[PDB]
Amino acid sequence: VEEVSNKQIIFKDYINGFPKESDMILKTSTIKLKVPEGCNDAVLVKNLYLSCDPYMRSRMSKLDNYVPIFIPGSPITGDGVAKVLDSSHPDFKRGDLIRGITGWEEYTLIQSAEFITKIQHDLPLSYHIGILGMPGLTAYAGFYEISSPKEGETVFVSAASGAVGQLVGQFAKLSGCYVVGSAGTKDKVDMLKNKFGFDDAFNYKEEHDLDAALKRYFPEGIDIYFDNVGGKMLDAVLPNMKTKGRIATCGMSQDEAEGVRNLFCIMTKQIRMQGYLVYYYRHLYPKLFDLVVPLLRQGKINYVEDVAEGLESAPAALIGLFSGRNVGKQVVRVATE
Amino acid sequence: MVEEVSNKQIIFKDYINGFPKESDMILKTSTIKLKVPEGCNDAVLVKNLYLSCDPYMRSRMSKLDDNYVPIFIPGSPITGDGVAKVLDSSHPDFKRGDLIRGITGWEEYTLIQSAEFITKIQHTDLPLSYHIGILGMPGLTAYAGFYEISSPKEGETVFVSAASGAVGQLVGQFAKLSGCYVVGSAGTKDKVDMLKNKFGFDDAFNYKEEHDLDAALKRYFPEGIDIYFDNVGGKMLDAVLPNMKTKGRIATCGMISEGVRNLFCIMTKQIRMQGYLVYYYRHLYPKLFDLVVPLLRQGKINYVEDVAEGLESAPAALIGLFSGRNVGKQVVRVATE
């Protein structure tokens, strides 16, 4: 059996300030390319793609646990695409491509096996941690399952250039809705309208009065607000909601949180604001695939990712995501197939 | 021929932008002839008996864009829900001697030229003032929030803010009759003792004397809150948010104007927060009477009202309600019969 080096991105220690590249350290360990004997229901994988997600910043502080905390001295963990090298688990074989929670390393011994799933098939492998993965399912559940979209309704999407937002907007146009998105750069604003079919889009940092901005695009209010940021943007959105409007709380800019002062609009506008966790909607994966996979090949839905090259660039890619410098879904390619 | 009598009125002075005061209303003695004017059709002349004081009337005293309620008119009497007796009528559905409830003037006599805002009172076995409280819009607000919004199940833990108020004292009782563990919050010792000894609440606390709201909620809800009936919002809603249960529900029944910063719990705990206006649920009135009238005769549900006497006391009763000095639903007896 081969014994190879296993480069790893180790989590240094819990922090209190803004995360730095110094909080992760590249460590070259070793591993034998076989599931240990006596280790049953385990899967040894080689990691190909790693997901950089915004929820992972909270895992870097001793906050005790919406999302489980990073263990210092251990590798970073998160969603990814991997290839099964060996398995003591009946539902996985050599050469199977999987998606789920793996280690920020070249090779991982997944003992759980419950948080990984066989990849169904033609399209780029990295799509299964994006439009065909948890971000896609998140967009599907927040828009179709929770927001109850009707044709002709008005939709506003915050952080629209991200993986979730860019799919919500395309879902909105498919349902015949007028959709507007907000983003942080001119290139993202242009990308939202030139590639994702957004009816309009604006740069929320060049607009100092956000109420005037939303009135400009929604002269009669917003039916559906897909909330990726919360905070100040949600406060500006609340008085601009239509009666019986709906807010899908997918994520939150939130170390003191911005006070939200317009929640009386929940009553005066009769808003239904609903939060959700994508993990509670795994049963909708077939509906997502059955919808997006045909139109992905029919070229009516696009998807933009930001691929960092090599495991060594994963720290820089993560903090760049924390700093909003990513363009689309941030991804680290650890190895080719 | 026909009587010309004095008609005392409570006149609205002018729009405000602060905390309302008694000097925002002015007592005025006008005259009126006790007949519907000739050539004025579909009108109903009434003698007002009871006037309602409701929290939404604070918003009618300020002029904003997006007013959500029709504002008051300076120089004209205050208007609101009331119980009145018809003296004359040019309207087919109302005749002399009928007792009606609906929007009327803060005065001894009102010429109601609408009639769409008034309906005949039919039971007339219960006290007349009940038709602007437990059998009026507050009772209807309570029924809609509990039976149409909140989705309660038996054994669920329910929290009610402003539980001694009109809406709070009846959803908390609707919750008990469905088998819920119910706790309410109020401002004085007598109000806490009233929720436990008369409204059958499991427990209750004084939010002034238990200033650490998080510790108070943890003390009475060791396992979290399933349903929060929000009547105040603000810091109380902020303290409730991290104390909700997973998939908990918040029915925004009302709100009195502090920035909320724990809205991340909406996503963390998958909470549904939904607001509503009772004016969209007038069709549920028969359901309310069908349910509450038998429970009243059987003594299964109680109703506490605050009766101020004389039209002249209406300014102070209205401000006292805004200041929390009322004990239960605040009404004003203008005349008997």
mmCIF file of N, CA and C in Angstrom, chain A residues 66 234 239 243-244 249-250 252 256-261 263-264 266-277 280, chain B residues 66 68 237 246-247 252-255 258-261 263-264 266-277 280-281:
data_model
loop_
_atom_site.group_PDB
_atom_site.id
_atom_site.type_symbol
_atom_site.label_atom_id
_atom_site.label_comp_id
_atom_site.label_asym_id
_atom_site.label_seq_id
_atom_site.Cartn_x
_atom_site.Cartn_y
_atom_site.Cartn_z
ATOM 1 N N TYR A 66 -24.271 27.236 16.261
ATOM 2 C CA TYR A 66 -25.178 27.095 15.129
ATOM 3 C C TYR A 66 -24.579 26.161 14.085
ATOM 4 N N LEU A 234 -31.820 45.065 4.929
ATOM 5 C CA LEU A 234 -33.149 44.606 5.318
ATOM 6 C C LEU A 234 -33.979 45.749 5.890
ATOM 7 N N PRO A 239 -39.723 49.007 4.725
ATOM 8 C CA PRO A 239 -40.803 49.933 4.346
ATOM 9 C C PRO A 239 -41.156 49.888 2.871
ATOM 10 N N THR A 243 -47.911 44.799 0.377
ATOM 11 C CA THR A 243 -48.793 44.127 1.319
ATOM 12 C C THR A 243 -48.782 42.624 1.058
ATOM 13 N N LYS A 244 -48.740 41.845 2.141
ATOM 14 C CA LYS A 244 -48.630 40.387 2.077
ATOM 15 C C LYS A 244 -47.343 39.951 1.378
ATOM 16 N N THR A 249 -35.318 34.536 4.600
ATOM 17 C CA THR A 249 -34.095 34.816 5.355
ATOM 18 C C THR A 249 -33.127 33.665 5.145
ATOM 19 N N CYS A 250 -32.312 33.796 4.108
ATOM 20 C CA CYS A 250 -31.341 32.779 3.742
ATOM 21 C C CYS A 250 -30.021 32.939 4.482
ATOM 22 N N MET A 252 -27.289 36.157 6.667
ATOM 23 C CA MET A 252 -27.005 37.508 7.135
ATOM 24 C C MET A 252 -25.483 37.669 7.187
ATOM 25 N N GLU A 256 -20.767 43.802 16.629
ATOM 26 C CA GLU A 256 -22.113 44.209 17.002
ATOM 27 C C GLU A 256 -23.003 44.267 15.764
ATOM 28 N N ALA A 257 -24.230 43.773 15.903
ATOM 29 C CA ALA A 257 -25.152 43.713 14.778
ATOM 30 C C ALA A 257 -25.872 45.041 14.598
ATOM 31 N N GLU A 258 -26.097 45.410 13.337
ATOM 32 C CA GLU A 258 -26.859 46.616 13.038
ATOM 33 C C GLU A 258 -28.290 46.463 13.538
ATOM 34 N N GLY A 259 -28.750 47.441 14.314
ATOM 35 C CA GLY A 259 -30.111 47.396 14.817
ATOM 36 C C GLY A 259 -31.119 47.562 13.696
ATOM 37 N N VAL A 260 -32.099 46.664 13.648
ATOM 38 C CA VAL A 260 -33.187 46.735 12.679
ATOM 39 C C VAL A 260 -34.365 47.416 13.357
ATOM 40 N N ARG A 261 -34.775 48.568 12.825
ATOM 41 C CA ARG A 261 -35.764 49.408 13.482
ATOM 42 C C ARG A 261 -37.111 49.456 12.773
ATOM 43 N N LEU A 263 -39.158 46.888 11.904
ATOM 44 C CA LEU A 263 -39.908 45.642 11.980
ATOM 45 C C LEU A 263 -41.401 45.862 12.189
ATOM 46 N N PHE A 264 -41.829 47.088 12.508
ATOM 47 C CA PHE A 264 -43.257 47.381 12.533
ATOM 48 C C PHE A 264 -43.892 47.197 11.163
ATOM 49 N N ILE A 266 -43.555 44.647 9.414
ATOM 50 C CA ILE A 266 -44.063 43.279 9.391
ATOM 51 C C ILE A 266 -45.565 43.277 9.643
ATOM 52 N N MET A 267 -46.034 44.174 10.512
ATOM 53 C CA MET A 267 -47.464 44.277 10.783
ATOM 54 C C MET A 267 -48.173 45.129 9.737
ATOM 55 N N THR A 268 -47.675 46.348 9.497
ATOM 56 C CA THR A 268 -48.378 47.280 8.618
ATOM 57 C C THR A 268 -48.424 46.788 7.176
ATOM 58 N N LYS A 269 -47.428 46.018 6.746
ATOM 59 C CA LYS A 269 -47.421 45.441 5.410
ATOM 60 C C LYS A 269 -47.829 43.975 5.398
ATOM 61 N N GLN A 270 -48.084 43.384 6.569
ATOM 62 C CA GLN A 270 -48.502 41.987 6.684
ATOM 63 C C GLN A 270 -47.509 41.055 5.990
ATOM 64 N N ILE A 271 -46.236 41.175 6.376
ATOM 65 C CA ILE A 271 -45.143 40.422 5.767
ATOM 66 C C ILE A 271 -45.035 39.055 6.424
ATOM 67 N N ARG A 272 -44.701 38.044 5.626
ATOM 68 C CA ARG A 272 -44.286 36.742 6.136
ATOM 69 C C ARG A 272 -42.780 36.621 5.932
ATOM 70 N N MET A 273 -42.024 36.735 7.020
ATOM 71 C CA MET A 273 -40.576 36.571 6.993
ATOM 72 C C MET A 273 -40.238 35.199 7.560
ATOM 73 N N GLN A 274 -39.560 34.376 6.765
ATOM 74 C CA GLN A 274 -39.283 33.000 7.148
ATOM 75 C C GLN A 274 -37.806 32.692 6.966
ATOM 76 N N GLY A 275 -37.185 32.181 8.019
ATOM 77 C CA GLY A 275 -35.848 31.653 7.911
ATOM 78 C C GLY A 275 -35.852 30.153 7.699
ATOM 79 N N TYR A 276 -34.751 29.644 7.154
ATOM 80 C CA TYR A 276 -34.661 28.221 6.864
ATOM 81 C C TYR A 276 -33.197 27.811 6.815
ATOM 82 N N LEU A 277 -32.968 26.515 7.002
ATOM 83 C CA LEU A 277 -31.645 25.915 6.891
ATOM 84 C C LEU A 277 -31.700 24.851 5.805
ATOM 85 N N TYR A 280 -32.566 21.133 6.070
ATOM 86 C CA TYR A 280 -33.922 20.646 6.291
ATOM 87 C C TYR A 280 -34.706 20.473 4.995
ATOM 88 N N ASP B 66 -46.984 56.742 3.576
ATOM 89 C CA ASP B 66 -47.276 55.350 3.925
ATOM 90 C C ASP B 66 -47.880 55.269 5.330
ATOM 91 N N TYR B 68 -50.619 53.761 6.504
ATOM 92 C CA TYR B 68 -51.153 52.456 6.903
ATOM 93 C C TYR B 68 -52.483 52.526 7.662
ATOM 94 N N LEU B 237 -39.009 41.731 21.912
ATOM 95 C CA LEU B 237 -38.867 40.845 20.763
ATOM 96 C C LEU B 237 -37.414 40.425 20.570
ATOM 97 N N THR B 246 -36.658 25.715 17.697
ATOM 98 C CA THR B 246 -36.503 25.460 16.272
ATOM 99 C C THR B 246 -37.876 25.396 15.613
ATOM 100 N N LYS B 247 -37.986 26.016 14.437
ATOM 101 C CA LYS B 247 -39.245 26.102 13.695
ATOM 102 C C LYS B 247 -40.329 26.813 14.500
ATOM 103 N N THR B 252 -46.907 38.575 14.726
ATOM 104 C CA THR B 252 -46.770 39.998 15.025
ATOM 105 C C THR B 252 -48.167 40.601 15.107
ATOM 106 N N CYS B 253 -48.774 40.489 16.289
ATOM 107 C CA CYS B 253 -50.125 40.999 16.501
ATOM 108 C C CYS B 253 -50.156 42.516 16.595
ATOM 109 N N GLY B 254 -49.068 43.122 17.051
ATOM 110 C CA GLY B 254 -49.001 44.562 17.203
ATOM 111 C C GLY B 254 -47.605 44.943 17.635
ATOM 112 N N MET B 255 -47.367 46.251 17.680
ATOM 113 C CA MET B 255 -46.037 46.736 18.020
ATOM 114 C C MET B 255 -46.117 48.190 18.454
ATOM 115 N N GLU B 258 -36.135 50.818 19.936
ATOM 116 C CA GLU B 258 -34.872 50.110 20.110
ATOM 117 C C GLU B 258 -34.610 49.148 18.955
ATOM 118 N N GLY B 259 -33.398 49.196 18.412
ATOM 119 C CA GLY B 259 -33.066 48.360 17.270
ATOM 120 C C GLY B 259 -32.985 46.894 17.660
ATOM 121 N N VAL B 260 -33.609 46.039 16.858
ATOM 122 C CA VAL B 260 -33.553 44.595 17.060
ATOM 123 C C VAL B 260 -32.288 44.068 16.396
ATOM 124 N N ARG B 261 -31.512 43.278 17.136
ATOM 125 C CA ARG B 261 -30.216 42.818 16.662
ATOM 126 C C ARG B 261 -30.069 41.304 16.611
ATOM 127 N N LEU B 263 -32.000 39.200 14.865
ATOM 128 C CA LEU B 263 -32.732 38.673 13.722
ATOM 129 C C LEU B 263 -32.000 37.529 13.031
ATOM 130 N N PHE B 264 -30.723 37.301 13.350
ATOM 131 C CA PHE B 264 -30.032 36.124 12.836
ATOM 132 C C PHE B 264 -30.671 34.833 13.328
ATOM 133 N N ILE B 266 -33.742 34.175 13.208
ATOM 134 C CA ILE B 266 -34.755 33.793 12.225
ATOM 135 C C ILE B 266 -34.225 32.684 11.327
ATOM 136 N N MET B 267 -32.970 32.807 10.890
ATOM 137 C CA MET B 267 -32.359 31.766 10.072
ATOM 138 C C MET B 267 -31.813 30.630 10.928
ATOM 139 N N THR B 268 -31.144 30.970 12.034
ATOM 140 C CA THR B 268 -30.539 29.954 12.890
ATOM 141 C C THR B 268 -31.577 28.960 13.399
ATOM 142 N N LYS B 269 -32.755 29.447 13.775
ATOM 143 C CA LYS B 269 -33.790 28.602 14.351
ATOM 144 C C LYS B 269 -34.947 28.332 13.400
ATOM 145 N N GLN B 270 -34.859 28.789 12.148
ATOM 146 C CA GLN B 270 -35.893 28.551 11.138
ATOM 147 C C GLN B 270 -37.256 29.044 11.620
ATOM 148 N N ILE B 271 -37.287 30.285 12.078
ATOM 149 C CA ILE B 271 -38.488 30.898 12.631
ATOM 150 C C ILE B 271 -39.302 31.513 11.504
ATOM 151 N N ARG B 272 -40.624 31.404 11.608
ATOM 152 C CA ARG B 272 -41.539 32.141 10.746
ATOM 153 C C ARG B 272 -42.119 33.304 11.539
ATOM 154 N N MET B 273 -41.854 34.521 11.078
ATOM 155 C CA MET B 273 -42.404 35.734 11.669
ATOM 156 C C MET B 273 -43.367 36.353 10.666
ATOM 157 N N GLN B 274 -44.637 36.461 11.049
ATOM 158 C CA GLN B 274 -45.687 36.891 10.135
ATOM 159 C C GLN B 274 -46.566 37.935 10.803
ATOM 160 N N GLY B 275 -46.758 39.061 10.123
ATOM 161 C CA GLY B 275 -47.648 40.098 10.589
ATOM 162 C C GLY B 275 -48.980 40.055 9.866
ATOM 163 N N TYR B 276 -49.963 40.737 10.445
ATOM 164 C CA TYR B 276 -51.311 40.734 9.898
ATOM 165 C C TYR B 276 -52.071 41.931 10.447
ATOM 166 N N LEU B 277 -53.077 42.365 9.694
ATOM 167 C CA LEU B 277 -53.979 43.430 10.109
ATOM 168 C C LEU B 277 -55.386 42.860 10.207
ATOM 169 N N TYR B 280 -58.269 42.820 7.502
ATOM 170 C CA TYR B 280 -58.337 41.842 6.426
ATOM 171 C C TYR B 280 -59.032 40.555 6.851
ATOM 172 N N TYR B 281 -59.645 40.532 8.038
ATOM 173 C CA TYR B 281 -60.263 39.320 8.561
ATOM 174 C C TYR B 281 -61.640 39.597 9.155
#
